[PDB]
Design a protein around this ligand. Structure first.
Ligand code: NQ9
Ligand code: NQ9
Ligand code: MG
Ligand code: MG
Ligand code: MG
Ligand code: MG
Ligand code: MG
Ligand code: MG
Lengths: 5, 236, 236, 5
């Protein structure tokens, strides 16, 4: 899963 | 609201205590109470709100994915029929997740966004609006899926337009917005080329502005720049 | 009960799904519903019940300790007065914790223990009774603290007496009971010598019976024996 | 903190 903030 | 009798300052104090205790449901409830006082939120307070709900919804998304995977496997050829339980429990978790998203979206619409005039506050809330529509989109399968996706897109796009006009390319809010909008493109909008372009352009324009920064601002910006690079690496 | 309309088997199925999803509040609610069907629990089911509540209360205990530490620091010389918030929120978490303990104790009293005739089931439930009285004791500060401690002691002692009569010294239930009773002595009853004696004697008597076991039973027993050794190491 | 099960 990709990085989000 | 159950928090209606508690002082604003006491709600903020308790939200901080709840964070230290890793009690994120409590933290979110405290912050919801604080928002419902009707005053604008400071930067620190906006971050408390975002941390709390990110952690609550994050847990729900992880649980949803576990359950959706089990459900998908149950609908493969040769899978023994086990009744409605998997679907029911995935639905339960889904409904709770949608409820949290609706709660956050509600706070933003009543009335955080409309009172937010400074770029930093307005972009922060519009990024949140995009994020919670994106979480709704992750689980959407019906008549309104397109409209939910479009609501996320519209919120992110407004935030991007303000951020490009009003904030430097290294601003952590501008960077985190771009990070997340890029993920929206890749995971939700079936637009991997747009995702990759956005992440690259954001990274490169930030790189070029690092020279203007203090050590501490450099730390903050480069952290998020690394997340952009991590996604690019995953995608290319 | 909100689970009154759900099939026993469906509650057990869902408790397993909730465990996979790390949804321990859900898992505990499912298992509570299953117990309230009124039938005895199998071994697998007893372990689902224990896992669920251990994880819920474990989280509450960890949060309580964080908050109690902050509260203690607030009552030191030179600490600036910050109002009632820390105490209030520690109290909130405490009350929720006590509620979970009371719920578990309630299930045991109505009517798990009285229907449990086999050593394995009876010792398991009596160990649980001791454990949840011990959690109550951890946060007790009033008129009833002694009685709460004595309730834990009495439950553990009954479980120990049955386990010594009816189970081999390597039985994992007998071992985990002794582990936890030893911790009761060290942390609750201010009896570190008793704690150490119990852990040592339990370890040594288990060591002497390992030769009787299959590979898989050996694995199970030696795991808990290592926890005994770990505590002994911490204490000596 | 000591080990329990
Ligand atoms: C008021 C304000 O300036 N809010 C943003 C601020 C920027 C620094 N920061 C972070 O970098 C971390 O989280 C973010 C959250 C939201 C956005 Cl838009 C960007 C970053 C804080 C934790 C860290 N491990 C990841 C980045 C805190 C919030
Ligand atoms: C019905 C029954 O036999 N229940 C006990 C069984 C024993 C093996 N086991 C364990 O060893 C672990 O947890 C325990 C829980 C309770 C007790 Cl009394 C003893 C052990 C399972 C997880 C492991 N990481 C620690 C020991 C499962 C339960
Ligand atoms: Mg006031
Ligand atoms: Mg649904
Ligand atoms: Mg462009
Ligand atoms: Mg039935
Ligand atoms: Mg109290
Ligand atoms: Mg003895």
């Amino acid at each position: 899963f990709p990085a989000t903030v | 609201g159950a928090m209606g009798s508690m002082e604003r300052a006491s709600l903020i104090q308790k939200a901080k205590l709840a964070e230290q205790a890793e009690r994120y449901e409590d933290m979110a409830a405290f912050m919801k109470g604080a928002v419902e006082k009707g005053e604008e939120l400071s930067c620190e307070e906006r971050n408390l709100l975002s941390v709390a709900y990110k952690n609550v919804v994050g847990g729900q998304r992880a649980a949803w994915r576990v359950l959706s995977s089990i459900e998908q496997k149950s609908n493969e050829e040769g899978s023994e029929e086990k009744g409605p339980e998997v679907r029911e429990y995935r639905e339960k978790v889904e409904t709770e997740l949608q409820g949290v998203c609706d709660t956050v979206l509600g706070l933003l619409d009543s009335h955080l966004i409309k009172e937010a005039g400074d770029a930093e506050s307005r972009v922060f809330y519009l990024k949140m609006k995009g994020d919670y529509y994106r979480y709704l989109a992750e689980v959407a399968t019906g008549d309104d899926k397109k409209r939910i996706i479009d609501s996320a897109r519209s919120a992110y796009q407004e935030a991007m337009d303000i951020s490009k006009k009003e904030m430097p390319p290294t601003n952590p809010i501008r960077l985190g917005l771009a990070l997340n909008f890029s993920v929206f493109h890749y995971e939700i909008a079936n637009s991997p080329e747009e995702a990759i372009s956005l992440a690259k352009t954001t990274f490169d324009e930030a790189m070029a502005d690092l020279h203007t920064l203090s050590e501490d601002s450099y730390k903050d910006s480069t952290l998020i720049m690394q997340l952009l690079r991590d996604n690019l690496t995953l995608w290319t």
